[PDB]
Design an enzyme around this catalytic site. Structure first.
Site, PDB file in Angstrom:
ATOM      1  N   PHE A  53       0.832  -1.187   0.000  1.00 11.28           N
ATOM      2  CA  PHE A  53       0.000   0.000   0.000  1.00 11.28           C
ATOM      3  C   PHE A  53       0.868   1.238   0.000  1.00 11.28           C
ATOM      4  O   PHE A  53       1.767   1.407   0.836  1.00 11.28           O
ATOM      5  CB  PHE A  53      -0.984  -0.004   1.202  1.00 11.28           C
ATOM      6  CG  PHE A  53      -2.056  -1.058   1.083  1.00 11.28           C
ATOM      7  CD1 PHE A  53      -1.767  -2.409   1.200  1.00 11.28           C
ATOM      8  CD2 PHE A  53      -3.349  -0.687   0.756  1.00 11.28           C
ATOM      9  CE1 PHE A  53      -2.758  -3.346   1.034  1.00 11.28           C
ATOM     10  CE2 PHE A  53      -4.344  -1.630   0.590  1.00 11.28           C
ATOM     11  CZ  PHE A  53      -4.039  -2.964   0.703  1.00 11.28           C
ATOM     12  N   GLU A 111      -1.856  -4.592  13.642  1.00 12.47           N
ATOM     13  CA  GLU A 111      -0.881  -5.527  14.221  1.00 12.47           C
ATOM     14  C   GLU A 111      -1.445  -6.245  15.449  1.00 12.47           C
ATOM     15  O   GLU A 111      -1.177  -7.430  15.663  1.00 12.47           O
ATOM     16  CB  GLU A 111       0.415  -4.791  14.572  1.00 12.47           C
ATOM     17  CG  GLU A 111       1.512  -5.664  15.128  1.00 12.47           C
ATOM     18  CD  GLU A 111       2.807  -4.876  15.214  1.00 12.47           C
ATOM     19  OE1 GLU A 111       3.007  -4.188  16.243  1.00 12.47           O
ATOM     20  OE2 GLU A 111       3.578  -4.857  14.226  1.00 12.47           O
TER      21      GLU A 111
HETATM   22  O1  LIG Z   1      -0.158   7.716   5.018  1.00 15.33           O
HETATM   23  C1  LIG Z   1       0.045   6.457   5.031  1.00 15.33           C
HETATM   24  C2  LIG Z   1       0.169   5.693   6.194  1.00 15.33           C
HETATM   25  C3  LIG Z   1       0.424   4.342   6.084  1.00 15.33           C
HETATM   26  N1  LIG Z   1       0.485   3.735   4.877  1.00 15.33           N
HETATM   27  C4  LIG Z   1       0.678   2.287   4.719  1.00 15.33           C
HETATM   28  O2  LIG Z   1       0.527   1.624   5.961  1.00 15.33           O
HETATM   29  C5  LIG Z   1       1.733   0.957   6.303  1.00 15.33           C
HETATM   30  C6  LIG Z   1       1.929   0.988   7.809  1.00 15.33           C
HETATM   31  O3  LIG Z   1       2.154   2.327   8.300  1.00 15.33           O
HETATM   32  P1  LIG Z   1       3.657   2.769   8.722  1.00 15.33           P
HETATM   33  O4  LIG Z   1       4.674   1.985   7.927  1.00 15.33           O
HETATM   34  O5  LIG Z   1       3.628   4.245   8.723  1.00 15.33           O
HETATM   35  O6  LIG Z   1       3.727   2.377  10.293  1.00 15.33           O
HETATM   36  P2  LIG Z   1       4.728   1.383  11.092  1.00 15.33           P
HETATM   37  O7  LIG Z   1       5.987   0.975  10.304  1.00 15.33           O
HETATM   38  O8  LIG Z   1       4.822   1.901  12.491  1.00 15.33           O
HETATM   39  O9  LIG Z   1       3.697   0.165  11.052  1.00 15.33           O
HETATM   40  C7  LIG Z   1       3.658  -0.896  11.995  1.00 15.33           C
HETATM   41  O10 LIG Z   1       2.505  -0.687  12.822  1.00 15.33           O
HETATM   42  C8  LIG Z   1       1.253  -0.550  12.101  1.00 15.33           C
HETATM   43  C9  LIG Z   1       0.150  -0.450  13.137  1.00 15.33           C
HETATM   44  O11 LIG Z   1       0.294   0.737  13.915  1.00 15.33           O
HETATM   45  C10 LIG Z   1       1.054  -1.734  11.147  1.00 15.33           C
HETATM   46  O12 LIG Z   1       0.697  -2.966  11.798  1.00 15.33           O
HETATM   47  C11 LIG Z   1       2.322  -1.997  10.294  1.00 15.33           C
HETATM   48  O13 LIG Z   1       2.173  -3.130   9.466  1.00 15.33           O
HETATM   49  C12 LIG Z   1       3.522  -2.160  11.172  1.00 15.33           C
HETATM   50  O14 LIG Z   1       4.727  -2.361  10.436  1.00 15.33           O
HETATM   51  C13 LIG Z   1       2.794   1.677   5.480  1.00 15.33           C
HETATM   52  O15 LIG Z   1       3.984   0.906   5.296  1.00 15.33           O
HETATM   53  C14 LIG Z   1       2.046   1.932   4.180  1.00 15.33           C
HETATM   54  O16 LIG Z   1       2.040   0.737   3.416  1.00 15.33           O
HETATM   55  C15 LIG Z   1       0.367   4.496   3.724  1.00 15.33           C
HETATM   56  O17 LIG Z   1       0.447   3.933   2.627  1.00 15.33           O
HETATM   57  N2  LIG Z   1       0.156   5.801   3.844  1.00 15.33           N
END
Ligand SMILES: O=c1ccn([C@@H]2O[C@H](COP(=O)(O)OP(=O)(O)O[C@H]3O[C@H](CO)[C@H](O)[C@H](O)[C@H]3O)[C@@H](O)[C@H]2O)c(=O)[nH]1
Ligand SMILES: O=c1ccn([C@@H]2O[C@H](COP(=O)(O)OP(=O)(O)O[C@H]3O[C@H](CO)[C@H](O)[C@H](O)[C@H]3O)[C@@H](O)[C@H]2O)c(=O)[nH]1
Ligand SMILES: [Mn+2]
Ligand SMILES: [Mn+2]
Lengths: 296, 296
Positions: free
Chosen positions: B64, B246
Site C-alpha cells: 500500500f 498488528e
Molecule cells: O499515510 C500512510 C500511512 C500508512 N500507509 C501504509 O501503511 C503501512 C503501515 O504504516 P507505517 O509503515 O507508517 O507504520 P509502522 O511501520 O509503524 O507500522 C507498523 O505498525 C502498524 C500499526 O500501527 C502496522 O501494523 C504496520 O504493518 C507495522 O509495520 C505503510 O507501510 C504503508 O504501506 C500508507 O500507505 N500511507
C-alpha cells in the site's frame, strides 16, 4: 477431515516458546527442505492435540500379519491401545491370510478394527513387498472414505511410549535406527543402476525405514502405487532390490521429499542398539524373533 | 498451482543433512506446533526452488502506497526486483490513491505489476488498518485466479538480501524485531478485554509484525477478513486496538497457528537495532522516515 475450515483454538496456558534457546542442541530438528524432524522436546502435544481434534481427525493404521506373523498381533494391538493416537479416532486395518487367528483385543471408545483377508506369498520378501500393492488397492476400497491419514507399519513391533498426532502431515518417513548417524555412502540403498530403486553414492538425504511411513491417504496412495509399479518394472527386468520395499521407499522419498521426518524414537531396536542418550523416549520397538524360523 | 500432482525432483548433488548436528545452536528453529522458524542455515534454497518451480508457483506481493507513501515505492520495487522470489513468477499489487505517482520500475521476465486504485483515509491508523479489508476485497477480484501465495508487506522498507520460496506455506507470520527476545508479558498485545484483539498476560507464542505476513490465497483471505471483521466490532464498541492491525494480526495468529514463522531476518530496523550476531542476513529492512511528517 483434512484441509477444511479450522475453528479457533481455545485459550491455553503453556510455557512461552524461547526464540533464543534451541529446543534440541544435540540433533537436527528440521530438514533442509523445512520439514520438521520429530524428536521429544520439539513439540507441545497439548497444542497439537487441540489442532487435530478440532479437525475431527481419523487415523488409519495398517499392519500385515501373514502366515506365522499372526503371533505378533496381540502385543502389537494391545500396546497400540495404550500408546497410539489415544483420544483420536483410530481405524486399524489388519491384513492377514488367517482371519480366524486375529486376537480379540479390547478397544477404547472411538477405535475400530477391520480384518482384510489377503493372499500369502511364499517368500517373505514377496510378503513384505506386496504390502505396497495391497495398501494401494485398499486406498479406493476403504481408506479414502474412512480415514484422513494412514500410518503403515511392520507387525513385529510394540509400542512403549506415545505415538500421536505430532507425526501427522501429508507425507512422512522415519529414520532407520541403524543409519541415523551414518554417512550417505554407508546407507544400504540399492546401488545397481539396473534397478528402479537405484540411488548413486553422492545422493540421498536419509535412510528411511520400511517399517514406519505414512501421510494423507492421497500421498500414501501415490507412494505405495509408485513403489509397487517400480517393483513390477524390476521384476520384469529380473532384478530384486537389495532391501526390497525399503529400497523403493527410499528412492521415492529421495525424489518426493517428506513433509515431516520421524526420529528413530519412532522405530527402534533396543536389543541391537541399546538406549543412547540421544533417544529421550523409545516409542515403537522391535520385538525379539528368530527371523529365519518365523519367515518359513 | 498449490496441492497438485507433484513430479519427481531431478538428481541433485548437495551436502548430506547431519542428523546429529543442529543446524542452529543459538536459536529456536521449530515452534512447539512443529512449524519451521525460518533462519539462515535452516534451508537449502536449491531444493526449495526445485520444489516450487516444479509446481509452477506464482507469488503475489501486496503493498500500500497511500498519500505521501508513494515516495517509498521506487526503492521498494527496485530492491524487490533484486531480492524477492527471483526466478519465480511474481505479481506485484500496488494499492494507491495516486496511480499517476507509481514509478516506472523495470521488471524481470515473468514478473508483472498491477496498480489498484483505492481511497485514502485521513488518519494513518485507518490507512494501516483498512489494508485488511482491501486485501480481503481483492482476494475475489484477482488473487484467487492470479496467484498461489500472497505476501503482504509495509512499503516503507527495502530488500537487502534474499527473500524467496523458503517463506511459502499455508500461513505465515514474522517475528517483530523489537520483541523476538522478549518475555510474553512485555509483548505489546492489546490488553483491554473490551477489544476483540485482547490477549491475556499468560497467553501468546510470539509478537508478530504487522509489516510482513502471508500464505495461500485462501488462508490470507481468512486472516484479513477475520481481522477486518474484528476491527469493525471494535469500532462499533468505541475502541481502537493499541497497535491497530498488528494487534488483530497477533490475536488471529495466536488462535490460528501459522505453518511457518519467519525470523527477524525478514523484518528488521538496523537504525534502531543494529546488526546482532544472531542475524546472519538482514533481508527486509526499514527505511528512514520522519514518521509524523510523512503520515500527515
Ligand atoms: O499515510 C500512510 C500511512 C500508512 N500507509 C501504509 O501503511 C503501512 C503501515 O504504516 P507505517 O509503515 O507508517 O507504520 P509502522 O511501520 O509503524 O507500522 C507498523 O505498525 C502498524 C500499526 O500501527 C502496522 O501494523 C504496520 O504493518 C507495522 O509495520 C505503510 O507501510 C504503508 O504501506 C500508507 O500507505 N500511507
Ligand atoms: O511371513 C511374513 C513375512 C513378513 N510379514 C510382514 O512383513 C513385514 C516385514 O517383514 P519382517 O518384519 O520380517 O522384516 P524386517 O523387520 O527385516 O523388515 C524390514 O525390511 C523389509 C525389507 O526387507 C521391509 O522394508 C520392512 O518394512 C523393514 O522393517 C512384517 O513386519 C510383517 O508385517 C508377514 O506378515 N509375514
Ligand atoms: Mn519388522
Ligand atoms: Mn512500516
Amino acid at each position: 477431515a483434512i484441509g477444511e475450515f479450522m475453528v479457533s483454538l481455545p485459550r491455553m496456558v503453556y510455557p512461552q516458546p524461547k526464540v533464543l534457546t534451541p529446543c534440541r542442541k544435540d540433533v537436527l530438528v528440521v530438514t533442509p527442505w523445512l520439514a520438521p524432524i520429530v524428536w521429544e522436546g520439539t513439540f507441545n502435544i497439548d497444542i497439537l492435540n487441540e489442532q487435530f481434534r478440532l479437525q475431527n481427525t481419523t487415523i488409519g493404521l495398517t499392519v500385515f500379519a501373514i502366515k506365522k506373523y499372526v503371533a505378533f498381533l496381540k502385543l502389537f494391538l494391545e500396546t497400540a491401545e495404550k500408546h497410539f493416537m489415544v483420544g483420536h479416532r483410530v481405524h486399524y486395518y489388519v491384513f492377514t491370510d488367517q482371519p480366524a487367528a486375529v486376537p480379540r483385543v479390547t478397544l477404547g471408545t472411538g477405535r475400530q478394527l477391520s480384518v482384510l483377508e489377503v493372499r500369502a506369498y511364499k517368500r517373505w520378501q514377496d510378503v513384505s513387498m506386496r504390502r505396497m500393492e495391497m495398501i494401494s488397492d485398499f486406498c479406493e476400497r476403504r481408506f479414502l472414505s474412512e480415514v484422513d491419514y494412514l500410518v503403515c507399519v511392520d507387525v513385529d513391533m510394540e509400542f512403549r511410549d506415545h505415538v500421536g498426532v505430532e507425526i501427522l502431515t501429508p507425507l512422512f518417513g522415519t529414520l532407520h535406527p541403524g543409519f541415523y548417524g551414518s554417512s550417505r555412502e554407508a546407507f544400504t540403498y540399492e546401488r545397481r543402476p539396473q534397478s528402479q530403486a537405484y540411488i548413486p553414492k553422492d545422493e540421498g538425504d536419509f535412510y528411511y525405514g520400511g517399517a514406519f511411513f505414512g501421510g494423507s491417504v492421497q500421498e500414501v496412495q501415490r507412494l505405495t502405487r509408485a513403489c509397487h509399479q517400480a517393483m513390477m518394472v524390476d521384476q520384469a527386468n529380473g532384478i530384486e532390490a537389495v532391501w526390497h520395499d525399503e529400497s523403493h521407499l527410499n528412492k521415492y522419498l529421495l525424489r518426493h521429499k517428506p513433509t515431516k521426518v520421524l526420529s528413530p524414537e519412532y522405530l527402534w531396536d533396543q536389543q541391537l542398539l541399546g538406549w543412547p542418550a540421544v533417544l529421550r523416549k523409545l516409542r515403537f520397538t522391535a520385538v525379539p524373533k528368530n527371523h529365519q524360523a518365523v519367515r518359513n
